[PDB]
Amino acid sequence: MNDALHIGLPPFLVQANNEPRVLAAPEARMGYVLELVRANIAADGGPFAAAVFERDSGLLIAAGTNRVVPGRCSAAHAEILALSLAQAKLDTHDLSADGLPACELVTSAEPCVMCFGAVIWSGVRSLVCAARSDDVEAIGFDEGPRPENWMGGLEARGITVTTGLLRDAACALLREYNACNGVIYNARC
Amino acid sequence: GHMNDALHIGLPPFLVQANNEPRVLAAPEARMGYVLELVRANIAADGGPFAAAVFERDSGLLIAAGTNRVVPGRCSAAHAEILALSLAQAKLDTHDLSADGLPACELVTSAEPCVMCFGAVIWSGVRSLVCAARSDDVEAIGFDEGPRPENWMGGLEARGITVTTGLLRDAACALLREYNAC
Ligand SMILES: Nc1ccnc(=O)[nH]1
Ligand SMILES: [Zn+2]
Ligand SMILES: [Zn+2]
Secondary structure, three states, X not given: OOOEEEEEOOHHHHHHOOOOOEOXXXXXXXXXXXXXXXXXXXXXXXXXXXXXXXXXXXXXXXXXXXXXXXXXXXXXXXXXXXXXXXXXXXXXXXXXXXXXXXOEEEEEEOOOHHHHHHHHHHOOOEEEEEEOHHHHXXXXXXXXXXXXXXXXXXXXXXXXXXXXXXXXXXXXXXXXXXXXXXXXXXXXX | OOXXXXXXXXXXXXXXXXXXXXXXXXXXXXXXXXXXXXXXXXXXXXXXXXXXXXXXXXXXXEEEEEEEOOOOOXXXXXXXXXXXHHHHHHHOOOOOOXXXXXXXXXXXXXXXXXXXXXXXXXXXXXXXXXXXXXXXXHHOOOOOOOOOOOOHHHHHHHOOOEEEOOOXXXXXXXXXXXXXXX
16 A cells, blocks of 8 residues: 555465465475576566575565565565565564564575664574575675674574575576566567 | 554654655765664664664665664564665565666665665665664674674675665764664
8 A cells, every 4th residue: 555565466466475384395395486587587576585484484474575666665685575574474673583483585596784783683594595696696686785704693583594505597597587688578588 | 563464563653654655865975864863763662772664775765774673573574774775675576676677776774784674775776775874883882793703794795785874873873872762
């Protein structure tokens, strides 16, 4: 509405937040996240996606993707959407809240500065990344002024960090995205 | 706010009204003054002691305002800045406030941004950031600003965003203290 923050979720993302799913393996988890990436790109969104799991069971709780441009909202990153939807579903601003399960945020690329903090407040206890910062930098997409050893900063707060998971297919997904960005029409896109 | 087809965070009456009531505050202190009033209402509306609003830098026209809604809105990302920036990018229909053909936009804020919002402002397109309360003032009432890069103000300056702080600061603290007192 015009009297409430309202970020719309594309059909495939709604489905992604609708169908129950459980993926044990980190590979499996990131694999599904990378599926939403390809989708997102085909739904007019940035090449970024994320999902919050119950970490210790693999129960998908919520997913998000970059809807910045189509959404006319710079704050609509993949991490912000998944972290919110996740908090809304479990109905609490704290995923670290008393009773809730230990949550985990699987993202296609190392988080930017905005989301970096977004992660700290969320209440998740673990972050799992795919594409290293350089890969993202490598094609525009600025990570933003993150403080020294942000990764360390997270470990310190109890948020375990991991990067590189399925980085190969992640960087590929970034590239065909970039490959298909210009304005001159290409039927192969 | 748990929906399906979209992420939805409702705004309380006063805030709803704030984004639809025509307003033009030319002076800087006027903008900040208004923002502080919002803080009060927000506290009164089970919200955190934080408010903010985007104004067209030169004209002083209120474009959108946002408060802290984390708790009542079960969303840890709902800070005064995030909302005010997002409703502004909504009204103007663009994810870029520094976009072509749009009068420069400023974000007057009750306190200095948290590392999150910090990045948030950067991606918004706002061309200036005026703050009231300082960071120690914030950590003083028990709120985290998170780990920010050495000299964040520089980062903003360097990225085309003018930083200016300490405005009505003292008035912004009586509000913080009051909140902490209760
Ligand atoms: N500066 C801030 C600290 C904590 N929460 C907020 O909403 N804002
Ligand atoms: Zn981000
Ligand atoms: Zn903030």
